[PDB]
């Protein structure tokens, strides 16, 4: 019927209306929104958002560290079968190696075969950018005109091997010994300066090789841009879907099956894709929060008492800010729940607890590749789950404040309509 009876049954609603009528309670909630936004998009260790982004990226990097060494790759620049091409990528987690060797000849690159070199180059560039970033520390979510320098090398040897030909990079026909080219390259809509150089090395007592050096100067390190790289990593793997043959250590957890095609890891890859997607959705709330900042104070006008039915045109914004913070918080938690081994089973669980959330280096800093990186995650997946959790627990008051602010504002928007 009427309101008295309704508030006799739901007193927290009565308290909500009292607050919605009181400019200083509204202003307090608007302050709280300012502070919790800063916790989410300005802080690092304390932000559930930051940790979720970090987990999503770490899970992709770690997937590759676990299986990269076992992944076949080979052939020439045209994506076809090579007779005798050995193409080696540095600072990658190979079998007892800090490089990965792509020398599978005669077999035809493609699905359930060796990954083509073109595809490995895409995967490698992404892995180097992520690893450089993780080593340096991810910035806060609000900070998105940061940049980093990334530099990586690879080599080509064997007759017929076209994967370091100068024309691939725009270098003079020859060229290949000492030649260099500097060129822009677009990465996530930003302009990066890129220097690619070539040398020929003739070691005294064995085969000649070509070395290519890529220097990326000004790669963006924003959350949005790095999650695009993690997406490129895990999708390149899933789409090229190459053949793999793993090597188990006797004793300790074991990988099944021992061979097949990488896209066969369907849960692992789906989970990492979901995590990235959720992290991207979450990072997209950043703009909504900034646009609807709550730092201006509110009241009546002309020194007249505050009227919740006419003076609350700010409420739509206040509601959108708070809804957006709460969406961040929930996607963050969702990211963690996709990968957290407490709720996994079968072969997926044993992949995460047995491989992804372990590391065989030696805790060495993030982004470090060693001769023992292979067949382990070495991306701080366990610590990142733990820290996401700790941050969420320390977000208890703020989460309540955000819900109270969303409710105050919803109440005023209601009064406001009519």
């Amino acid at each position, epitope marked *: 019927e009427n309101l008295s009876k309704l508030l006799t049954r739901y*007193s*927290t609603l009565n*308290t*909500l209306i009292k*607050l919605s009528a009181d400019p200083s309670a509204i202003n307090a909630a608007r302050e709280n929104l300012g502070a919790s936004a800063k916790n989410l998009i300005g802080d690092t260790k304390n932000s559930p958002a930051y940790q979720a982004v970090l987990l999503a990226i770490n899970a992709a990097v770690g997937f590759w560290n676990v299986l990269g060494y076992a992944t076949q790759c080979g052939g020439n620049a045209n994506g076809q079968e090579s007779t005798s091409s050995t193409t080696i990528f540095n600072n990658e987690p190979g079998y007892r190696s800090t490089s990965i060797t792509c020398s599978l000849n005669r077999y035809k690159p493609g699905y359930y075969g060796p990954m083509s070199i073109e595809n490995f180059k895409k995967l490698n560039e992404a892995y180097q950018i992520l690893q450089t970033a993780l080593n340096k520390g991810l910035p806060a979510l609000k900070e998105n005109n940061g940049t980093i320098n990334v530099e990586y090398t690879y080599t080509c040897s064997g007759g017929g091997n076209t994967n370091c030909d100068p024309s691939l990079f725009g270098i003079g026909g020859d060229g290949r010994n000492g030649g260099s080219v500097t060129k822009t390259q677009t990465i996530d809509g930003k302009q990066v300066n890129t220097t690619i150089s070539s040398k020929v090395v003739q070691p005294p007592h064995s085969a000649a090789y070509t070395e290519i050096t890529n220097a990326l100067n000004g790669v963006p390190d924003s959350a949005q841009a790095l999650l695009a790289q993690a997406s490129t990593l895990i999708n390149t793997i899933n789409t090229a879907c190459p053949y793999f043959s793993v090597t188990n250590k006797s004793g300790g957890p074991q990988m099944e099956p021992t061979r097949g095609k990488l896209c066969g890891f369907t849960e692992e890859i789906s989970a990492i894709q979901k995590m990235i997607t959720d992290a991207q959705e979450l990072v997209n709330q950043t703009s909504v929060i900034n646009e609807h900042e709550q730092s201006t104070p509110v009241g009546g006008n002309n020194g007249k008492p505050f009227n919740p039915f006419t003076d609350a045109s700010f409420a739509q914004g206040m509601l959108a800010n708070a809804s957006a913070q*709460a969406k961040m*918080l*929930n996607l963050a*938690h969702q990211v963690g*729940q996709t990968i*957290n081994p*407490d*709720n996994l089973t079968g072969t997926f669980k044993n992949f995460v607890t047995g491989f992804l959330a372990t590391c065989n280096n030696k805790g060495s800093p993030p982004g470090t590749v060693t001769t023992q990186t292979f067949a382990s995650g070495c991306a701080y997946v366990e610590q990142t789950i*733990t820290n996401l*959790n*700790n941050s*969420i*627990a*320390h*977000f*208890g*008051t703020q*989460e*309540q404040q955000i*819900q*109270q602010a969303e409710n105050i504002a919803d109440t005023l928007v209601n009064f406001g309509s009519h």
Partner: nanobody, 113 residues
Framework: VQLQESGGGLVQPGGSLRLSCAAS????????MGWYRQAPGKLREWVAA???????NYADSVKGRFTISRDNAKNMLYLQMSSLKPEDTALYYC????????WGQGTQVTVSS
């Protein structure tokens, strides 16, 4: 997808109480859990929380008086309250963090002489 609190009651100031929360596995397993309360005239207030690995943290108003704990084998959350005051009178609720959006009935705690 369910939450249920018990162990509240009327006590004397100085008194003490142990609350329990039975949570479903989908809510509890792998999730930060926590306690909350709703005092007369006020909105729900966060009180404490604890990570799956059992690390607790508390609001300033209860730090050093209350202790939250969890038993991961029975999907149970506990809150142990000492040196209770009349300020601590409220309906107490449990949930994960972040919150599942349907709350339990709560358990009433009243403190008075």
């Amino acid at each position: 997808v369910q939450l249920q609190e018990s162990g509240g009651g009327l006590v004397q100031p100085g008194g003490s109480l142990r609350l329990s929360c039975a949570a479903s596995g989908s809510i509890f397993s792998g999730n930060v859990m926590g306690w909350y309360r709703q005092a007369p005239g006020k909105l729900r207030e966060w009180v404490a929380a604890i990570t799956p690995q059992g690390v607790p943290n508390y609001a300033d108003s209860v730090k050093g008086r209350f202790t939250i704990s969890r038993d991961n084998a029975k999907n149970m959350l506990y809150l142990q309250m000492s040196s209770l005051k009349p300020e601590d009178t409220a309906l107490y609720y449990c949930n994960r963090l972040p919150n599942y959006r349907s709350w339990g009935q709560g358990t009433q705690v009243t403190v008075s002489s």
